[PDB]
Structure 1
Amino acid sequence: MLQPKRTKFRKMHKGRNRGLAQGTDVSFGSFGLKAVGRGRLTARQIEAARRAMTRAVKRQGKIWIRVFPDKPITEKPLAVRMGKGKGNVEYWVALIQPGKVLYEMDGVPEELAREAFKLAAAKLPIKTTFVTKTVM
């Protein structure tokens, strides 16, 4: 379950998720899982997907996690009236736009990488796709 070790501020505004993402290229490895839809990713979703990838591939190749949940999300506890202060921090998300290379991997045959990405995409809440490193 990913989380920043310390932050400048405990709570953060809601913000918007407009625009299209950068980091749209496979950078370190060769085979990448890239987002097509738009939404948030819980650190639990990241952890579940990473576990599915690593235990589908059975520890060959190497896995890069190109996203980090830096944004704290508050939730007001139940049976509480509106107002009286912003709610307590509950979990952390990463805002993901279309075209964000989510996961990346190397050292693995193509069909195995495609299968592992299929399990990862089944764990993800957003549209994803398979991409391949291009020399430019």
Structure 2
Amino acid sequence: MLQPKRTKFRKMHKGRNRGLAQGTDVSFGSFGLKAVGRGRLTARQIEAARRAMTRAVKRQGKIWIRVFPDKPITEKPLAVRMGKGKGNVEYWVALIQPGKVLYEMDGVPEELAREAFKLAAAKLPIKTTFVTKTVM
């Protein structure tokens, strides 16, 4: 699973996930899996989708993961009362706003990339769409 090699701090405030995305254009490949929805992608989800794409294209073309899970998510364990410090870091998420290109791909035909992105999308908790590299 992806996670920062180091972080400045172990734990982050929950924060909010308002706003539209920044990395909105296909900037590295020919095709992209854009996020229509708003949510968080765990590192496990990103990895599951990546395995799905990579296996679908059969080690062909090339894949960019435009999102990195850099936010630690704490959980409290079972049977633990509500106070007494922040929970432990269990997993890492990328916050995803609408418009975020999540994955990019090239070196494949558009039909194959559409299939691969469909498999990956099925791995993911947010609604996605298939986008193409845009001239300007």
Same fold, TM-score > 0.5, yes or no: yes
What value does the CA root-mean-square deviation take over the aligned residues?
Answer: 0.5
Q: Which residue does the alignment assign to 1:37?
A: 37
2: distance between equivalents of 1:124 and 1:80? 30
2: distance between equivalents of 1:33 and 1:90? 27
The count of aligned residue pairs is 136
TM-score (normalizing by structure 1)? 0.99
Q: How much has 1:13 moved relative to structure 2?
A: 0.1
2: distance between equivalents of 1:7 and 1:32? 28
Q: How much has 1:134 moved relative to structure 2?
A: 1.2
Q: How much has 1:110 moved relative to structure 2?
A: 1.0
Q: How much has 1:82 moved relative to structure 2?
A: 0.8
TM-score (normalizing by structure 2)? 0.99
Q: SS at 1:24's partner residue?
A: coil
Q: Which residue does the alignment assign to 1:130?
A: 130
2: distance between equivalents of 1:60 and 1:81? 50
Q: How much has 1:99 moved relative to structure 2?
A: 0.3
Residue segments in structure 2 that go unaligned for 5+ positions in a row: none
Residue by residue, what CA displacement relative to the aligned partner does 1:83-114 show, whole Å, maximum 9, x if unpaired?
Answer: 01111110000100000000000010111110
Q: How much has 1:30 moved relative to structure 2?
A: 0.6
Q: How much has 1:23 moved relative to structure 2?
A: 1.0
Q: How much has 1:135 moved relative to structure 2?
A: 1.1
User: Percent of aligned positions with the same letter in both sequences?
Assistant: 100
Q: How much has 1:76 moved relative to structure 2?
A: 0.4
2: distance between equivalents of 1:114 and 1:67? 19
